[PDB]
Point group: C6
Chain length 214, copies 6
Amino acid sequence: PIVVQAAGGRSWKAVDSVMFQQLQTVAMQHGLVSEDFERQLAYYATTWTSKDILEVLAMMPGNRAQKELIQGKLNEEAERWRRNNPPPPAGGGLTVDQIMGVGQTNQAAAQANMDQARQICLQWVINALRAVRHMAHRPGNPMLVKQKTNEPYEDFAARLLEAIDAEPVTQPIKDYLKLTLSYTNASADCQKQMDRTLGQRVQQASVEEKMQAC
Amino acid sequence: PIVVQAAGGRSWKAVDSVMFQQLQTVAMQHGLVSEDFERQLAYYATTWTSKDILEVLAMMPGNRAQKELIQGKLNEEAERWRRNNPPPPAGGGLTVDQIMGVGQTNQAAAQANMDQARQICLQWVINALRAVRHMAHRPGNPMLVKQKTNEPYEDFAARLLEAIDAEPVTQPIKDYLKLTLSYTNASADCQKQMDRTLGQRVQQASVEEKMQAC
Amino acid sequence: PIVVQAAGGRSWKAVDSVMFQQLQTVAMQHGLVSEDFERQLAYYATTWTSKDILEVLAMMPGNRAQKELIQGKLNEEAERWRRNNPPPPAGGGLTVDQIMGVGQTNQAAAQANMDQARQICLQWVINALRAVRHMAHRPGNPMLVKQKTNEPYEDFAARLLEAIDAEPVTQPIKDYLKLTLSYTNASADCQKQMDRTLGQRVQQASVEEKMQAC
Amino acid sequence: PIVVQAAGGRSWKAVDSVMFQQLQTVAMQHGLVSEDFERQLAYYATTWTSKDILEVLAMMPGNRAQKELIQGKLNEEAERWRRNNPPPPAGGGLTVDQIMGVGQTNQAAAQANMDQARQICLQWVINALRAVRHMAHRPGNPMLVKQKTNEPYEDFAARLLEAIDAEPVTQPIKDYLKLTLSYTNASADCQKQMDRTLGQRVQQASVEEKMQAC
Amino acid sequence: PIVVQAAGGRSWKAVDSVMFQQLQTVAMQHGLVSEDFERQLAYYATTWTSKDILEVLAMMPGNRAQKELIQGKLNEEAERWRRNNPPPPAGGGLTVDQIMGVGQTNQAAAQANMDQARQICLQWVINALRAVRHMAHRPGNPMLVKQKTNEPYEDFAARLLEAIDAEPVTQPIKDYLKLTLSYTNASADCQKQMDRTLGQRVQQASVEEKMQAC
Amino acid sequence: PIVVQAAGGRSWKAVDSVMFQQLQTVAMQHGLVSEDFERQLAYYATTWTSKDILEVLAMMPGNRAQKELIQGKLNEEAERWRRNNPPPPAGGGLTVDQIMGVGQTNQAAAQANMDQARQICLQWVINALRAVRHMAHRPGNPMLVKQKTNEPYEDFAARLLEAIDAEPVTQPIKDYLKLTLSYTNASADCQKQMDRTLGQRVQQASVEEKMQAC
């Protein structure tokens, strides 16, 4: 974390044991790659220095094969950033090193010059966790989801909505799935009940309207 | 949360892990849509910035079908606010975006300019949670409640009072129900005991007076 | 709670999660109406603003029939206060509204003008909890208490002393009960042992002197 | 507790929930009258105002017969103090009321004028707890203690030392007991072993020297 | 820990019980020599004075044979440092004593003069823990690892990656192992599946590409 | 504990409940006389005033026979200090009373004049705990230790190293034991394996070298 001193200069402070434990328990209960960990990480990582975002991620509980993958993606995110942007002549303001906090004192990766590098690092870590999560799902998962025999639509909606979230497809194509796949994937019995209540709203009806049926 | 610095300027601070856990456990023990979560949220969310009210709600434990509904209602609350009020020419002081903290640094959604947007956001979240809760109950629930055979009136009162609370009907019509439905719903045996003790106070007697019987 | 800033102006702060949990656990372990909750509430509620005394009571764990009664009494306490005191012309310094923190920002129910209203509110809540507790006991409970066959006098004293506490009768009439009922309620076997050891101190002997017997 | 503000004026603060729980658990695990509670109370009660020493004692877990006795003794301690000292003309600097914090705002029982009353109150509470503890033991307990058949001397020493502590006899007469009763109470088998090893040190040997035997 | 006072002078503060417990639990759950303990130690030990790095390591939970080894290595690290660097004439700026905080007040091992000694001490402790860990593994562990019959490649990757980490061989030779040993160690059935999917990428394919197979 | 105020004057503060619990749990899990308690006590007792070192030791969990012994030794440590040093004429700067904090306000045993007395008190308490621990072990314990039949050398090393630690013999004579007793105490089977691998290093080999065998 970074503490902004009264004068205006900034100093480094270690992640507060409590916050470290909170992120740890969430990773242990769910997954380091899980969406939950990503959510809490982003909210509390604003203050975290680029080096901390990488040390307090490597202390979190997970498999060693998984950690290699999370570091595989953080590398491809870095190489992309190096490519997407031509270095400015003289090598520019920033480097993947500065961003990943390589060879920097913990009180210099928390100075004002590293605010931008600090944000880009967290951006990559969240993207890396999402990438490992996305691959963990074979494509077509919303298509694969089918309302289980005699299972509440709520349960089907929860599987289907997560499956649509699992896909990295843009929000608009995700929306289409919520409208189209829900009715189709819906088990025939709910689908017949939806057809009578929804009527023409076969795709028009929202998932909530579909939830009203069965 | 927002911290008001001595000078008067305001800065952003993350929800204190302890408070986050307290809201989380309450949601896990009851429901994110449950009244309990709504109560603690409102008391502790005053300081919370509009963005936090939306991030610290999405980290709370609940079903994914339920979260879609809570976001369904927050949308209809926003569209209503956009409709109820004509935008002032030049688009006015505020936008649903400013209110929902869209594209704002966490240290700018906590400045004095966003006090009003901060309150309107929480207003919508509490209303959204109530709406999901209300629909979860089919209308006529107080009418549906009937003192269970050989069950304490206290237990009946607890079901009936919550059922009256479940209805979004104004407080005065809710009061009428406490006076009228209680005696009628009351099982014949308590109802006969209430008739002799209450006498003319068949609807006049308060639920507490009815509690004295059986 | 209210924080007195150095300048002298006051600002509002939410009940510290820890203190909220401490009151909550006590209510869950005992009762919201229980004496224990009343004791801790009074000690820690001094700082609490009138609004908090009512929000941090409604979040505490209890039955919904019970909460109606606690709000029934807080109403009769308010109507009494409205009656006991004629409003001063112009409606006076205070109103039940100001006292119950109705339509007040949480940073204005904590200003110096609301110190008096803040205390009167807590006074009513403690009285309300006591009233629900008192009614929960049918009158004559000390008279009803009888030393159980072959039960330590200590156990009898604990039941009888609480029964005398349950009665809202003034402290002096409560004292008489400790002196008179104890010996009479005492089971014949202890009562015979008390008669020989106490001698003339049949009512003169304190409960502690009676405790020495059996 | 009392907080000494920078200027020098003092203000009242509630016992920190953590410290309250620590004293509570100790009382629940041992006893409110137990020595353990008395030890922690004295160390942490220095700051506590006279009123707090009486409110944070009445919230602690114990039987209601026991609490009457603890209040019985606090009364006889007060009447003694009222007797032991003639009131100075005009009624003097202090009163049992000021000492027991009767009719005083919690921010006035923590001002410098009440430092002396604050200490005298705690003095009485510790003495009161000791008195209830002492009576709980019939006199002659060290004499009653006898090394149990085939029980470690350590276990005997622990019972005997507590029994000597239970007696309110001055420290010097307590010491004599550690030297005399130990050997006599010691079971014949250890006593024979002590006689050969201790030799003339039958009373001369300390309990530690006796511990070396069996 | 070291606290930098406003003036600029530094003072000593004990490791915060919470942080001590966090390191302790991690050591108890894993090992004092375990990598996990090393990670958290390095992140939180920056502030720790050289003396604390040695006292808060000796209080951590572990076997006494293990602690001798951790102190064996810290000695050979010190003798190396004494050798690697000739002492400057007059014995130079620093000594293994100053580094290991020998005969220094806890408020002088935290002054600015001991920043360098403070870092060198932690450097040795982390190296010492790694050395005990490395020896605990017989050389050739990656070679020893063989994908267990009918075990997920993920599980094999986790064993193999840790085995490659166990070896103190430079990062580049470790990388070669991830590319070469993985396919060879891979059980014939996965190895055949890898051969068809990987094709020429027998060593070219990354562990993640190998993970895609079985 | 002692708090150094900005001006420079010092004030007393009670041991932070958390730190008290941490020392308590360690004593309960191990022993008040155990080495573990001694380690944490020394690190956290620097700030503690002489009176606290004696009150926060008497509240710790242990047998009453044990506490008498810990107070037996603290007395012989004091009498030694009184003897070892002639009192300076006028009775000198210090007294065992000042050191043991006898008849001193808790805000005067924490002033700068009592820094020296504060350290000497803790010195005695640690020595007292060690003395009780040492006697608890009959002399010759390292000689007594013999590698248990079919038990890892590690387990033998752990028993032997603690046994060498149990002895209060100077560090150099303790070292000789680690070199000599280890091989001799080692069970014949490990001893034969050590003889072949160690060769001439029968006493030359360190315990770690011996650990490599069996």
